[PDB]
Ligand SMILES: [Cu+]
C-alpha cells in the first residue's frame with residue numbers, strides 16, 4: 287500500500303504531533319484541499335466542527351481496496367503517512383461532494 291496509519295482510530299486534536307502537517311475540516315470543506323507534501327510525510331486531518339467527517343480514498347488509490355477513514359467528531363484527528371510519490375484524491379464518505387487531494391513529491 288501507499289500509506290501507513292499511525293492511529294487506527296480518531297485521536298484527540300490536543301495530541302497532534304510536533305509541527306505536524308495539518309488539514310483542518312470546517313464549513314463542510316477540507317480547508318487545504320490541494321496539499322503538497324514530500325515522500326515520507328504524515329498528514330493529519332482535524333475536524334473543527336460538530337458535523338462528523340472522515341477521509342476516504344477509493345479502491346486502487348492507496349491500496350487494492352478503498353481506505354475509508356474512521357468517523358471524526360469535533361476536535362478529533364486522523365493521520366496518514368505517504369510513502370510513494372503521486373497524487374491521491376479523497377472525499378468525505380458522509381459528504382462526497384467534499385473533496386481534497388494530497389500531492390506527494
Ligand atoms: Cu463530511
Ligand code: NA
Pocket residue numbers: 310317
Ligand atoms: Na484554515
